[PDB]
Ligand binder design. Structure first.
Ligand SMILES: *[C@@H]1O[C@H](CO)[C@@H](O[C@@H]2O[C@H](CO)[C@@H](O[C@@H]3O[C@H](CO)[C@@H](O)[C@H](O[C@@H]4O[C@H](CO)[C@@H](O)[C@H](O)[C@@H]4O)[C@@H]3O)[C@H](O)[C@H]2NC(C)=O)[C@H](O)[C@H]1NC(C)=O
Ligand SMILES: CCCCCCCCO[C@@H]1O[C@H](CO)[C@@H](O)[C@H](O)[C@H]1O
Ligand SMILES: CCCCCCCCO[C@@H]1O[C@H](CO)[C@@H](O)[C@H](O)[C@H]1O
Ligand SMILES: CCCCCCCCO[C@@H]1O[C@H](CO)[C@@H](O)[C@H](O)[C@H]1O
Ligand SMILES: CCCCCCCCO[C@@H]1O[C@H](CO)[C@@H](O)[C@H](O)[C@H]1O
Ligand SMILES: CCCCCCCCO[C@@H]1O[C@H](CO)[C@@H](O)[C@H](O)[C@H]1O
Ligand SMILES: *C(=O)CCCCCCCCCCCCCCC
Lengths: 326, 11
């Protein structure tokens, strides 16, 4: 026996010695040293100090620069708002709780923190899907005489909200559940214990298929088509050095985007798959925070890739931060 | 294709 079970939790540490306590009631210094809880807090501090300015600045320059308020940019605004739900739903909470060594807000605060942090990351995830569907529709021109307007952009944002609610709300009404994960300082979906009263197994399947595989297929199809269309256009227009440059830039950005998506979600999907197929094995607290580390750092590196590496946003940000220079 | 690439933020 490798863990300790409670009504609303699973502590990944055996109670053979009798030292295990409810992660809602007492510190968990028996599954990690205090200095590791301090390093957890230090990491949350890093993600706040970087993730908040980068994502807030994205909203701010959009308010100050008229040319940013285009429909194809709406979804990037959505990305920045979603990353802020991650910053204040999860990161700040986990900074606070880690300094106590346990989840001081109780089962209720566990559902709040789990709902808003999972909602933030799922809005961000489906924003990357919708961004690719749109780029594919606009560049590859799969439809006859279709012009992408403001109402399509709003439809795309609402679709991300609905898809993220379809992931974050069921654990509040009895399909899966929210419990403290890893070092017991942050709450997330229970994708690792076979809690049958909330039907965890079928929810993890539904998560794996609908919120990982389908986003993976759509992103790969849409950008595969986009790279193919751009390479086809450049091959048929080799007298244009700019078009050859565009082809190289699009291919480089597409590689960065799909690699960044894999770095963000493949560890969560891999660990969940391994736990699913090897049901009945020891999975420690710090090992469980590895896929959390990868997914949460995307609140910093997604806006670097999708905002700061975008010519228009970078120009306006530099202008805003340097008071008025180019 | 170039104008569409600029619109979507890829070039
Ligand atoms: C990991 O393993 C730990 C060791 O078993 C376990 O801790 C124990 O939890 C039990 C309660 O479930 C504690 O029991 C109480 O101890 C106090 C003081 O010794 C007693 O007073 C109390 O008795 C009560 O007496 C009342 C008299 O009016 C009576 O009305 C009440 O009904 C009741 O009988 C209990 O005996 C025990 O002390 C704990 N031991 C330690 C070492 O902490 C952890 O809960 C377990 N961890 C998890 C997460 O489950
Ligand atoms: C950003 C603000 C962080 C708040 C730090 C909370 C620390 C919890 O304070 C706790 O109070 C008790 C009083 O002795 C003790 O049990 C603990 O040693 C102490 O950590
Ligand atoms: C795709 C893998 C199968 C499902 C595993 C779900 C575990 C993820 O957990 C959830 O996802 C969020 C990211 O948006 C985490 O940051 C949150 O802590 C949590 O709510
Ligand atoms: C996520 C949305 C992507 C699904 C779209 C299915 C595309 C089916 O196939 C596509 O249809 C286009 C229509 O003219 C054709 O031009 C293309 O040859 C073909 O790639
Ligand atoms: C070949 C398939 C093309 C279908 C086009 C989708 C419908 C777009 O037409 C709709 O009508 C509104 C009228 O103002 C537009 O402004 C909206 O953008 C749009 O929702
Ligand atoms: C999901 C879409 C994945 C993108 C596949 C990228 C394949 C192109 O990658 C490489 O790019 C080089 C420079 O452009 C070329 O020399 C090669 O043709 C090509 O192999
Ligand atoms: C108008 O010209 C404003 C110019 C601002 C230039 C300021 C350069 C300082 C860079 C700040 C980096 C501080 C990092 C601190 C780490 C905690």
């Amino acid at each position: 026996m490798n863990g300790t079970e409670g009504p609303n939790f699973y502590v990944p540490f055996s109670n053979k010695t009798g030292v295990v306590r409810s992660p809602f009631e007492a510190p968990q210094y028996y599954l990690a040293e205090p200095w590791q809880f301090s390093m957890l807090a230090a990491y949350m501090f890093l993600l706040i100090m970087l993730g908040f300015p980068i994502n807030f600045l994205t909203l701010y320059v959009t308010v100050q620069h008229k040319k940013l308020r285009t429909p194809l940019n709406y979804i990037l605004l959505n990305l920045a708002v979603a990353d802020l739900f991650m910053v204040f739903g999860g990161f700040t909470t986990t900074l606070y709780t880690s300094l106590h060594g346990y989840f001081v807000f109780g089962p209720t605060g566990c559902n709040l923190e789990g709902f808003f942090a999972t909602l933030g990351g799922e809005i961000a995830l489906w924003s990357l899907v919708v961004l690719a569907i749109e780029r594919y529709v606009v560049v590859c021109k799969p439809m006859s005489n279709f012009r992408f307007g403001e109402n399509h952009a709003i439809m795309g944002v609402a679709f991300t909200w609905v898809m993220a609610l379809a992931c974050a709300a069921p654990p509040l009404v009895g399909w899966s559940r929210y419990i403290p994960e890893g070092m017991q300082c942050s709450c997330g979906i229970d994708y690792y214990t076979p809690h049958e009263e909330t039907n965890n197994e079928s929810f993890v399947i539904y998560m794996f298929v609908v919120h990982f595989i389908i986003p993976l297929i759509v992103i790969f199809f849409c950008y595969g088509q986009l790279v193919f269309t751009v390479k086809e256009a450049a091959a048929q227009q080799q007298e244009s050095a700019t078009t050859q440059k565009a082809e190289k830039e699009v291919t480089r950005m597409v590689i960065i985007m799909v690699i960044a998506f894999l770095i963000c979600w493949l560890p969560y999907a891999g660990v969940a798959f391994y736990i699913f197929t090897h049901q009945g094995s020891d999975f420690g607290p710090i090992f469980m925070t590895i896929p959390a580390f990868f997914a949460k750092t995307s609140a910093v590196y997604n806006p670097v890739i999708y905002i700061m590496m975008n010519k228009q946003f970078r120009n306006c940000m530099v202008t805003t931060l340097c008071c008025g220079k180019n | 294709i170039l104008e569409n690439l600029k619109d979507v933020g890829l070039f």
